[PDB]
Amino acid sequence: EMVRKCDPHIGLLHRGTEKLIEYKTYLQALPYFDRLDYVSMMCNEQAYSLAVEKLLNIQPPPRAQWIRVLFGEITRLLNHIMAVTTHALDIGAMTPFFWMFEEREKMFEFYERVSGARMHAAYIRPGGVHQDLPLGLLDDIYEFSKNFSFRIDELEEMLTNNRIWRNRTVDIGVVTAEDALNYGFSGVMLRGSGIQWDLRKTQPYDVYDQVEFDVPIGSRGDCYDRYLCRVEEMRQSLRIISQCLNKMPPGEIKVDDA
Amino acid sequence: MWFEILPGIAVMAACLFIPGMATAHIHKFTNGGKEKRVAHFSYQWNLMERDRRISGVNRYHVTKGLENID
Amino acid sequence: SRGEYVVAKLDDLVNWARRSSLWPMTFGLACCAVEMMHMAAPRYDMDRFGVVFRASPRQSDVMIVAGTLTNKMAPALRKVYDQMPEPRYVVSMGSCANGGGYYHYSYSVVRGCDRIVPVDIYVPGCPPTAEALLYGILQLQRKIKREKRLRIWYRR
Amino acid sequence: TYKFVNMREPSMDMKSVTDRAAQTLLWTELVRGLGMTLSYLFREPATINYPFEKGPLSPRFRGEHALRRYPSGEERCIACKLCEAVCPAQAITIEAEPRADGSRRTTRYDIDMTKCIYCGFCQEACPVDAIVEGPNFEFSTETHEELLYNKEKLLNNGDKWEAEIAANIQADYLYR
Amino acid sequence: MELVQVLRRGLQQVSGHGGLRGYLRVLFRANDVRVGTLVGEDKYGNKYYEDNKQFFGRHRWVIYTTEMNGRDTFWDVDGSMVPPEWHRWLHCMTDDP
Amino acid sequence: MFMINILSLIIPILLAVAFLTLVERKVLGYMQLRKGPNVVGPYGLLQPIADALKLFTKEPLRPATSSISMFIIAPILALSLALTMWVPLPMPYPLINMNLGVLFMLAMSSLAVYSILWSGWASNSKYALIGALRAVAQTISYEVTLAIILLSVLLMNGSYTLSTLITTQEHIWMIFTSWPLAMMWFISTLAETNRAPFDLTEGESELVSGFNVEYAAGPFAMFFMAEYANIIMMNAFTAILFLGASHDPHTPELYTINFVLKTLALTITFLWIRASYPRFRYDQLMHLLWKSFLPLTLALCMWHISLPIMTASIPPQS
Amino acid sequence: YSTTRKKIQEWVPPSTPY
Amino acid sequence: MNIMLTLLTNVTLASLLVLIAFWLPQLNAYSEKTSPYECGFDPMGSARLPFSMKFFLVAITFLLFDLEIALLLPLPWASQTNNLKTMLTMALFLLILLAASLAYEWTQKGLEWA
Numbered sequence A: 001e002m003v004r005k006c007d008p009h010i011g012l013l014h015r016g017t018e019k020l021i022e023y024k025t026y027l028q029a030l031p032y033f034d035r036l037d038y039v040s041m042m043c044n045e046q047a048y049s050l051a052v053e054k055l056l057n058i059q060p061p062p063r064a065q066w067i068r069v070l071f072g073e074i075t076r077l078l079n080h081i082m083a084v085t086t087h088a089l090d091i092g093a094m095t096p097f098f099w100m101f102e103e104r105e106k107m108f109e110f111y112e113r114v115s116g117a118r119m120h121a122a123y124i125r126p127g128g129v130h131q132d133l134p135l136g137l138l139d140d141i142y143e144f145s146k147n148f149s150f151r152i153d154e155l156e157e158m159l160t161n162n163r164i165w166r167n168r169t170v171d172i173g174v175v176t177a178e179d180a181l182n183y184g185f186s187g188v189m190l191r192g193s194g195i196q197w198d199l200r201k202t203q204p205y206d207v208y209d210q211v212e213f214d215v216p217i218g219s220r221g222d223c224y225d226r227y228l229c230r231v232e233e234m235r236q237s238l239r240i241i242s243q244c245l246n247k248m249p250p251g252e253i254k255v256d257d258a
Numbered sequence B: 001m002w003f004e005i006l007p008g009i010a011v012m013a014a015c016l017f018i019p020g021m022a023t024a025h026i027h028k029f030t031n032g033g034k035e036k037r038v039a040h041f042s043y044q045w046n047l048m049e050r051d052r053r054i055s056g057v058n059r060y061h062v063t064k065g066l067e068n069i070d
Numbered sequence C: 001s002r003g004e005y006v007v008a009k010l011d012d013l014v015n016w017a018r019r020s021s022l023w024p025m026t027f028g029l030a031c032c033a034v035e036m037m038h039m040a041a042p043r044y045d046m047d048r049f050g051v052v053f054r055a056s057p058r059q060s061d062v063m064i065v066a067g068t069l070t071n072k073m074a075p076a077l078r079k080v081y082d083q084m085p086e087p088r089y090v091v092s093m094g095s096c097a098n099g100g101g102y103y104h105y106s107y108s109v110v111r112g113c114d115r116i117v118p119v120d121i122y123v124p125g126c127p128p129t130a131e132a133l134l135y136g137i138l139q140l141q142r143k144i145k146r147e148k149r150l151r152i153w154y155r156r
Numbered sequence D: 001t002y003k004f005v006n007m008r009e010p011s012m013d014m015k016s017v018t019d020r021a022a023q024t025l026l027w028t029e030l031v032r033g034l035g036m037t038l039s040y041l042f043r044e045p046a047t048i049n050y051p052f053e054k055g056p057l058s059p060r061f062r063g064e065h066a067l068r069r070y071p072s073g074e075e076r077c078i079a080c081k082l083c084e085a086v087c088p089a090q091a092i093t094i095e096a097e098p099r100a101d102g103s104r105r106t107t108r109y110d111i112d113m114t115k116c117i118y119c120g121f122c123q124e125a126c127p128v129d130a131i132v133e134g135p136n137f138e139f140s141t142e143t144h145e146e147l148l149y150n151k152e153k154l155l156n157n158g159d160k161w162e163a164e165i166a167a168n169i170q171a172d173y174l175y176r
Numbered sequence E: 001m002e003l004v005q006v007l008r009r010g011l012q013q014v015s016g017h018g019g020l021r022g023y024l025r026v027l028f029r030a031n032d033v034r035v036g037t038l039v040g041e042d043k044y045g046n047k048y049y050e051d052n053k054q055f056f057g058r059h060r061w062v063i064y065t066t067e068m069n070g071r072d073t074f075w076d077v078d079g080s081m082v083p084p085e086w087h088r089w090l091h092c093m094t095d096d097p
Numbered sequence F: 001m002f003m004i005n006i007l008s009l010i011i012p013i014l015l016a017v018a019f020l021t022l023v024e025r026k027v028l029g030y031m032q033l034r035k036g037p038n039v040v041g042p043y044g045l046l047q048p049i050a051d052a053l054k055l056f057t058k059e060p061l062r063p064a065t066s067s068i069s070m071f072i073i074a075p076i077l078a079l080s081l082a083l084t085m086w087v088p089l090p091m092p093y094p095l096i097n098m099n100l101g102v103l104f105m106l107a108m109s110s111l112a113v114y115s116i117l118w119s120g121w122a123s124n125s126k127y128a129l130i131g132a133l134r135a136v137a138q139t140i141s142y143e144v145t146l147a148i149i150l151l152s153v154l155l156m157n158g159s160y161t162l163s164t165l166i167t168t169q170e171h172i173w174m175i176f177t178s179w180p181l182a183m184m185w186f187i188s189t190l191a192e193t194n195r196a197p198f199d200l201t202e203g204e205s206e207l208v209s210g211f212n213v214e215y216a217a218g219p220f221a222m223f224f225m226a227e228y229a230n231i232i233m234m235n236a237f238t239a240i241l242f243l244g245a246s247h248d249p250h251t252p253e254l255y256t257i258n259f260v261l262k263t264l265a266l267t268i269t270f271l272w273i274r275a276s277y278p279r280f281r282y283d284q285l286m287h288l289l290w291k292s293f294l295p296l297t298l299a300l301c302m303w304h305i306s307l308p309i310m311t312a313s314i315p316p317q318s
Numbered sequence G: 001y002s003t004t005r006k007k008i009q010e011w012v013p014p015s016t017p018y
Numbered sequence H: 001m002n003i004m005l006t007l008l009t010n011v012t013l014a015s016l017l018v019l020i021a022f023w024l025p026q027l028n029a030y031s032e033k034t035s036p037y038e039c040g041f042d043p044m045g046s047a048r049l050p051f052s053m054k055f056f057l058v059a060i061t062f063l064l065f066d067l068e069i070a071l072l073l074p075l076p077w078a079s080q081t082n083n084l085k086t087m088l089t090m091a092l093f094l095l096i097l098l099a100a101s102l103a104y105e106w107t108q109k110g111l112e113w114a
Ligand SMILES: CCCCCCCCCCCCCCCCC[C@@H](O)O[C@H](CO[C@H](O)CCCCCCCCCCCCCCC)COP(=O)(O)OCC[N+](C)(C)C
Pocket: A163, A164, D023, D024, D025, D026, D027, D030, D031, D034, F179, F180, F182, F183, F184, F186, F187, F197, F273, F288, F292, F293, F296
């Protein structure tokens, strides 16, 4: 009943992307990226639009950068919700799921509102951003964001102390902090083993120069620490939303360069 | 809301309610209100042994009183 | 008390029965897995319609095929479809597997989901909004309700 | 910046020791979480009563396509054909031929929802604002051949919804 | 204050008029403005939620085949064009024509 | 007319497991905020029969690889014993006055899981065998502590007969006397019945519906049904055994009216457990038992052996 | 269905002999 | 009698449910549909030997506790014996050994369960 070696066989969903991308012009390639890490649909677009703007040597008007970070962060919350949740569902917690996807649905109400699609919002553009966001939105984001924290907190009351959950995930599956680096682990899988590194603080790309937030380092490198990193990073993103709401300059959003 | 659970749960109760009644009265229905008789030990059965034969009827539900001796 | 009358009654009974609590199993292969889940999310709650995601085809009937299909994957799909009990159904979903959709032209996709299994209702979208899906399955019930093997069997 | 999740460690003070021991034996946090779900039993359920009620959407929302007319009653489409030229799925196929009047027109504008990805590039692309990604979002159907809309079908969709679509575009275009 | 609530169940029981049918099809209950138009029947509402506001009610005679209590009502049954825009909160502030 | 009494015991309970299913989806629904089944009811009520009809109507294939005899005989045994355990249960008046029917409750409960072993053995599938095996592990592992703590709570009622267990609770309730054993009895009923945190037999995401998989329509309905039989039944058992009540012989019905409350009050709790905790995994599931529950069950056991002598409080029954 | 009429409109032999 | 009657009615009930379960749907079984489930892809081989010492290493201990509880059962009745001091030691005694047995397993690392 012990495993002796797990033998993953990916490619069961190799839709074949990179070959397709080559035949289609830049603007027509963008949607593929939503179709990639689909749980985190905005950040992929942002990754691309940066990737072109460097080649194209062109800089978005600042407001666009503030949106790009803002939805970068709401998406940060989406992936973390989905991650912590379904990771719980895999070990049978069942409930927290339903408590959260209400919220996650309220976030899709925002993608719904600005992009016109509930998700896969081809909205970030190489030039900056697509349509400007509707006037009625920001207060609406405010009203939600102020109340979300109780929800995440209550989640945490069902999990972090729930010592059954602790015992199931606390001594697994530790990875050596250097050995991570040899395998090129990234993001949270690094921080769980306590190494300081993080790209937003390290090589900031947008207004992250102008936002302030605390990166949560793990320690033991067990799944549990990674979990707390997920939660805490949720709270921190929830910190970012405040700052972006409080400094959101008027101006254009697409680049002037027609 | 949550109160709306109740139609679902009350139907439970009544169902479970039924056997508890249905047996308890059948006893009285058969035993003539004597409310059944347990016989865990040989002796108590010996009392039901002495009975039935004492009643002219074999059904021992009836307990002939003092009048029986005269 | 015509025999046909009674047959109409039993027809109504079993077809209403099967249509009233079908139990999907799900290949949430690609990214339309998540929208499936929002059907089961509290805000729309598939369960109130009685439908409940239960794994293992042998305990399930209707099959959702969310998300893009691929070549290596296909044979497993045909396996799972074969192992379902009659009266099995399926449901193609999204522009995903209605016919490759976005990925219509690649070596690894298998165009439509149609080319390996006999699909029932289609639910176009990319992703379809979970609610459009909901209209999908309700439409599926309004197709089961028109099923009538009993009326026909007596007729033959 | 960097923060230590965990790292904090329990006190060995005897009051605290007896507290953790009593916690283990008497399951405090367990009953805490259990009390929490008790608490969520009493909140009002979030479900909408679909069909009878339907979820909130947005003016910008994307759905079924539909070519649409001038108020004059004339159709808008003029076969600049770049809807074909910008759709990533290339769902669209167009074959224009001249009107007897000599105006440009389509002969068999068509589209197939089987390949369309509802990205809304067509919605952006049209110079005369002919094709429009309609508000309708439900048209799930029995048979694959129905998905592959003909031109006439799109017009009929444009007829069914025109007040509605014109309402959305009216409510939205300034942001464009 | 349970008595006032049960009393609300009573007032709803009277105002709904034969609520047993509406709960036999439309699944209850409280109703509201009863604004209407459309190809047939239809309905409207207002209450206390961003999602529970603005209900609907299928035409008893429907577009053709009879649709009523214990009948298979369509979701596509709702009046085309105008009413969904008020019904999806695309413009709930903008009352149906 | 004893036969109609039996029939009167068997029909209502099956109705009860059906509506138990529905309540399960209901409450377990409202914990999730989402409403449970509703549309078909009006209050969902008509659902379970539609459900069962959906099952029995549906084709139940005889697997090509499976041996057929075991494959059929197992479900039969499952419902069999699931129902048979109900007979000697004082409500207030037992259908049968077994001199020692508690011990019999243990007997039925102990033959129960054997059906699981066949259920996974004849099913032939890999998941079937592995899941069935771990299932039998957890089960037996809990029946030992089970029966010991039940013993220790029975030293003081007097004897194994059940009706007396009413008499011994004409005031204080057993629970105030020995609640910790009531805890362990509770959890052992929470695992023996294979429920929420102790979830493994079904396996679920861990093993895609466990042993039960290869069973299709009707037999699946039987294992499902029998499972709920055991859940309500151990619940009722705990109810009579740890929660006494006033009992006027002239109005037995009154007592039952109370009893179904006190037991239903338990069954709901399992559901409200199900909505709350992630499952243990097969190591820890047995770890907490052999390492942690058991020694307390023993120490408590000697303690309860020893109270009646020190307190000079030895129970009456011969 | 198919839209935009025909293609080659190929000619056919005359009814009249020779 | 009494109990045999309820046994018969229960078993006949269940068997009745079986027969109405099979001889009813009346549809088409066929090969590959009847092939064993294996999460899609076909099995690499029929079920063989999931061997583990860690099964019996504890399960046997189950069996030797169950024999013990079999001796514990007489206790409630034995409690009413005329001479408890003659009894009481033994009432404790076995439990000690039960515990003792466990204790011996506890720390020879023979109890690795799983
Ligand atoms: C005169 C003196 C006589 C005696 C007086 C003193 C009484 C003795 C002390 C009473 C203790 C009895 C409690 C029962 C044993 C508890 C041990 C159990 O919890 O084991 C733990 C395992 O815990 C259990 O598995 C909990 C899971 C049970 C899930 C069901 C939740 C129950 C909800 C509450 C229901 C209460 C209803 C009845 C109340 C009256 C293993 O501990 P460990 O390995 O070190 O780390 C985990 C610690 N935990 C507890 C935080 C998880």
